[PDB]
């Protein structure tokens, strides 16, 4: 089994910084482990149950494995995880200033014992702090900054961009540099950094590493870094959606010609399924009123709007009922079409195939529950406009149905 000593008897949140100091002077002895200094461990119980196995090893490289399986058999055993907030810091941390980052450091030092850190070893705010990975709080502050890395992530679970730099980073000049260095120490309260440091162009800027900022800002170089690969994203998802716009454009070109193969092209790219032009129209809108039986079912599968409806209010299933393309109303009607759809004038697809003479959309759309009584604005049912046209044949079958 395991055996503890009765000073560390009790659970390890429990464990002043002292008691932390004696388990690793008791493990080493009990496990033969390289000596450890006891100041690579200068924190209390509820501070060592945040860190993880990495902090654990980076810590000790020689016996950190060793140590933090010992924690986790102790922890086993037994049957940190709850954190009281002062007032001013009960805030959310996006909103901190930087006085508020400051303050969170002494009460951490506090709460969990730990080596004084100076309130200039993170001069920012609270966004800025948000923004750093746990390799900036280690490289500020090695003793504690995992601890407080972890302290910060329990607190979470528990981008504006100005008009002149609103263009892609690789196009920035190099007065524009200069400007982002001076907009992001004004938003993120960060120590004022001269010109001179970053003196390059946006494109010469994206090669440097993280390590260059580092060393060419040791106060701010790191948030500069993480704020600048945000942008880029945004940049990259805002540059996205840019171009799906304009490839659902060429989509609905591509969808009124027939072209199969360009179709799936700019689908697979990203084109917008359900694209819609000055009039209202939609991909399938298109395809459908000019008989591309083929190019229907594949933007049906990609997810185009069955029932979408343009500005006039015909349905895809209007236009190819009225221009007679049989083939592509019994596609529609299976994907769930409406049989009973009105437009603005309150033309059923029942009554464009009456106004235009198709018998076979007709009894289609009678089998699938089209409504015979159904009425325009002008009060007139489906039989009523075949009459005026002089469609014997469609009046028939209407005619019987009363």
């Given at each position: 089994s395991i055996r503890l000593p009765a000073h560390l008897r009790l659970q390890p949140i429990y464990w002043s910084r002292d008691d932390v100091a004696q388990w690793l002077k008791w493990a080493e002895n009990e496990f033969s482990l390289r000596p450890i200094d006891s100041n690579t461990f200068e924190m209390n119980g509820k501070a060592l149950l945040l860190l993880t196995k990495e902090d654990f090893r980076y810590r000790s490289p020689h016996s950190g494995d060793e140590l933090y399986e010992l924690l986790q058999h102790i922890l086993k055993q037994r049957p940190s995880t709850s954190i009281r907030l002062p007032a001013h810091l009960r805030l959310q941390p996006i909103y901190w200033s930087r006085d508020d980052v400051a303050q969170w450091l002494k009460w951490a030092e506090n709460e969990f014992s730990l080596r004084p850190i100076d309130?200039?070893?993170?001069?920012?705010?609270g966004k800025a702090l948000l923004l750093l990975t746990k390799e900036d709080f280690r490289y500020r502050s090695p003793h504690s900054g995992d601890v407080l890395y972890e302290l910060l992530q329990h607190i979470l679970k528990q981008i504006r961009l100005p008009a002149h730099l609103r263009?892609?980073?690789?196009?920035?000049s190099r007065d524009d540099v200069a400007q982002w260095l001076k907009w992001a120490e004004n938003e993120f309260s960060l120590r004022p950094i001269d010109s001179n440091t970053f003196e390059m162009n946006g494109k010469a800027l994206l090669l440097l590493t993280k390590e260059d900022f580092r060393y060419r800002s040791p106060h701010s170089g790191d948030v500069l870094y993480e704020l600048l690969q945000h942008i880029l994203k945004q940049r990259d998802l805002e540059a996205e959606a840019a171009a799906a716009e304009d490839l659902g454009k060429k989509l609905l070109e591509a969808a009124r010609a027939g072209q199969d193969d360009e179709v799936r092209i700019l689908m697979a790219n990203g084109?917008?399924?359900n694209a819609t032009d000055n009039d209202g129209y939609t991909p399938l809108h298109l395809a459908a009123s000019n008989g591309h039986l083929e190019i229907v079912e594949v933007l049906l599968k990609n997810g185009?709007?069955?029932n979408a409806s343009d500005l006039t209010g015909i349905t895809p299933l209007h236009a190819a009922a009225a221009t007679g393309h049989l083939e592509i109303v019994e596609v529609l009607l299976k994907h769930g079409?409406?049989?009973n759809a009105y437009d603005n004038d309150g033309h059923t697809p029942l009554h464009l195939a009456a106004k235009y003479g198709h018998l076979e959309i007709v009894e289609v759309l009678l089998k699938h529950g089209?409504?015979?009584?159904a009425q325009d604005k002008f009060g007139k049912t489906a039989f009523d406009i075949s009459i005026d046209n002089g469609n014997e044949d469609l009046a028939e079958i209407l005619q019987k149905l009363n």
């Open positions: 309130s200039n070893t993170f001069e920012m705010n263009l892609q980073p690789i196009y920035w084109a917008d399924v185009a709007d069955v079409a409406d049989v089209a409504d015979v009584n």
